[PDB]
RNA sequence: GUACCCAUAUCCGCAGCAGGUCUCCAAGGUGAACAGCCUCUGGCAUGUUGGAACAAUGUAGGUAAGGGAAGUCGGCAAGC
RNA sequence: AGGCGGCCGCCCCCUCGCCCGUCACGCACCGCACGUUCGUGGGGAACCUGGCGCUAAACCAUUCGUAGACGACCUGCUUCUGGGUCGGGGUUUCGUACGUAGCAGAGCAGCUCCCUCGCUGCGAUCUAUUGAAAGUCAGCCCUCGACACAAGGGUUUGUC
C-alpha cells in the first residue's frame, strides 16, 4: 500500500528547508529470502553460459 | 443417497454486482440454481412459486438483498431422469437476518 | 529491488532523513482517525457495549 | 351484399418491411389542457433469435475542479 | 562449441607385430563397368535372450484476479495451519430507522366533578430511545463459530 510521511527536510538553499514536507510514500512487504541454488557463468564470445 | 434438508442465507446483493436493471432479477435465479447445484451436487434444481414471489416481489432492479432459503433433496421415480436426485428449493420468511446461519433441518 | 548500477551524489542520495509522522488512517474510504484507541476515545460508547 | 383483417402479421410498397391509407366510442389522479407521467376496463410478450463476458471503435443518454467560445468558416452541437 | 590421448601395477597370450633372401599354395572365375573405404553409415516400427534400474507429467474440467474481446497469463484443491458459503467483528458510506412516551409543538374541535397548565380527539415538525437504522467485496482485512466439500472425472505424451 501507499502512505504519507511528514518529513523534515535537511536540504539547504531552498524554500523547502527547515519545514515539514508531506510526500507520497509506498510500502512494499519483503519477507526474507531463503537460499536454494548456486548458478555459475562462463564468459563466452557470444555472452554468458 | 440421502434425503437431507438444510437452510441457507444466500446473499444475492454480493452474488450480483454489475448486472443491468432488466436482468438483475432473472440472473438472481440462475445464481440460486448454481448455488443449489454447488451445495447439494445434483444438476436438477426446482425452485418454488413462493421463492419466485420472494425474489420478484420488488421489481427487476430492486432485488431483495438476502433471502432465507431451504434446500431439500428427494428421490425421483416413475421413469426418472438420469439424475435420480433433485433439489427442491423452498422459501421460508424471516423478519431479521442477524445471527442466522446454516441449520440442518430434520 | 535492484541496486543502482551507477553511483551519484547530486545532493540527492545519502541524506539523513528525519521521520516524524506516518499516517495510518482508513485508506478504505476517507480516513478520519489514526489509531483504534484514539477513535474509541473520541467517539465514546456505542451500542457495542 | 351480409364470415373475417380493417393492421408495427389478412391492404399497397417483390416480404409477417420503423414507410403510406379515410372514420365513431372514449374513464381515475396530478394537471389550464384530448399536453407529459402513473393506474382501471380491455389487449400484449418487447416486435424475423437465445446464453456468457462488459475490450477497442461506434450508436443514443448523463456528468466533470479553474477559465468561459480562447476550437471552428461560422456558439455547429450541447447547455442556461 | 570438451571424449580422445599420456603414466603406473597386473592380465588370455604373442618373441613371423617391420624391412632382405629361399620354398610351395590359396578361384588362375579363361579381355572388360558400379571394386576395394572413416560403416559394428543417419534416424524411424517391431522380433527372442543377460544384468542394472525407473514407477510420472502436461492439457481439458473447476476455481481465482494481480488478467482478460476469444484464446492467452498468475493462482487454490490434505482431511488438518486445506479451500468454499453463511455468521461474527474491524474499517467505511449516508445521516439519527419502525414502534413507544412527552408537563415541546402554529393551533383547532368536543366533554363536564364546571374544572386553582382539567381531560379527550386531529395536528407540519421536535425531543429521548439514536454517531441510530441500512449496505459493506461481488476486485477490502481477520475469523481455527455453524454447515457441507475434499484420491472425483476425460484427452495425450519416451531417449542407440
Ligand atoms: Mg361483420
Ligand atoms: Mg407495417
Ligand atoms: Mg403506421
Ligand atoms: Mg419495395
Ligand atoms: Mg381526467
Ligand atoms: Mg384539476
Ligand atoms: Mg423474445
Ligand atoms: Mg412484426
Ligand atoms: Mg467544467
Ligand atoms: Mg465547476
Ligand atoms: Mg462569465
Ligand atoms: Mg469574448
Ligand atoms: Mg473566422
Ligand atoms: Mg443550437
Ligand atoms: Mg449544466
Ligand atoms: Mg425510510
Report on this model:
It is classed as ribosome. The entry lists the keywords translocation rabbit ribosome, 80S, eEF2, head swivel, rotation, ribosome. TRNA translocation by the eukaryotic 80S ribosome and the impact of GTP hydrolysis, Translocation-intermediate-POST-3 (TI-POST-3). Chains A, C: ribosomal protein uL3. Organism of A, C: Oryctolagus cuniculus. Chain B: ribosomal protein eL31. The structure is cut from a larger assembly and holds 2 copies of chain A (about 50 residues) and 1 copy of chain B (about 110 residues). Chain A has strands at about 1-10, 20-25, 45, 45-49. Chain A is an all-beta fold and about 50 residues long. Chain A has a two-stranded antiparallel sheet with strand order 1-2. Chain A is elongated and about 55 Å long. Chain B is an alpha+beta fold. In chain B, about 25% of the residues lie in helices and about 25% in strands. Chain B contains 3 helices and 4 strands; from the N terminus they run βααβαββ. Chain B has helices at about 10-15, 25-40, 50-55; strands at about 5-10, 45, 65-75, 85-90. Chain B has a 4-stranded mixed β-sheet. The longest helix of chain B is centred in the first third of the chain and has 17 residues, at about 25-40. Chain B is globular and about 40 Å long. Chains in contact: A-C. Chains A and C meet through strand 1 of A and strand 1 of C. Strand 1 (about 1-10) of chain A pairs antiparallel with strand 1 of chain C. Bound molecules: magnesium ion (16 copies). Chain B binds 2 RNA strands through strand 1, helix 1 and helix 2.
Amino acid at each position: 500500500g501507499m502512505t504519507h510521511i511528514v518529513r523534515e527536510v535537511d536540504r539547504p538553499g531552498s524554500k523547502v528547508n527547515k519545514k515539514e514536507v508531506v510526500e507520497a510514500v509506498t510500502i512494499v512487504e519483503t519477507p526474507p529470502m531463503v537460499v536454494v541454488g548456486i548458478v555459475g557463468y562462463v564468459e563466452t564470445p557470444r555472452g554468458l553460459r | 443417497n440421502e434425503v437431507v434438508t438444510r437452510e441457507y442465507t444466500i446473499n444475492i446483493h454480493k452474488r450480483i454486482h454489475g448486472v443491468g436493471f432488466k436482468k438483475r432479477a432473472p440472473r438472481a435465479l440462475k445464481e440460486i440454481r448454481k448455488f443449489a447445484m454447488k451445495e447439494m451436487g445434483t444438476p436438477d434444481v426446482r425452485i418454488d412459486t413462493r421463492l419466485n414471489k420472494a425474489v420478484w416481489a420488488k421489481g427487476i432492479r430492486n432485488v431483495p438483498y438476502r433471502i432465507r432459503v431451504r434446500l431439500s433433496r428427494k428421490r425421483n421415480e416413475d421413469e426418472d431422469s438420469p439424475n435420480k436426485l433433485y433439489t427442491l428449493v423452498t422459501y421460508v420468511p424471516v423478519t431479521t437476518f442477524k445471527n442466522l446461519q446454516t441449520v440442518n433441518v430434520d | 529491488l535492484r541496486k543502482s548500477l551507477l553511483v551519484q551524489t547530486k545532493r540527492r542520495a545519502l541524506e539523513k532523513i528525519d521521520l516524524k509522522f506516518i499516517d495510518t488512517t482508513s485508506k478504505f474510504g476517507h480516513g478520519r482517525f489514526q489509531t483504534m484507541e484514539e477513535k474509541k476515545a473520541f467517539m465514546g460508547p456505542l451500542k457495542k457495549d
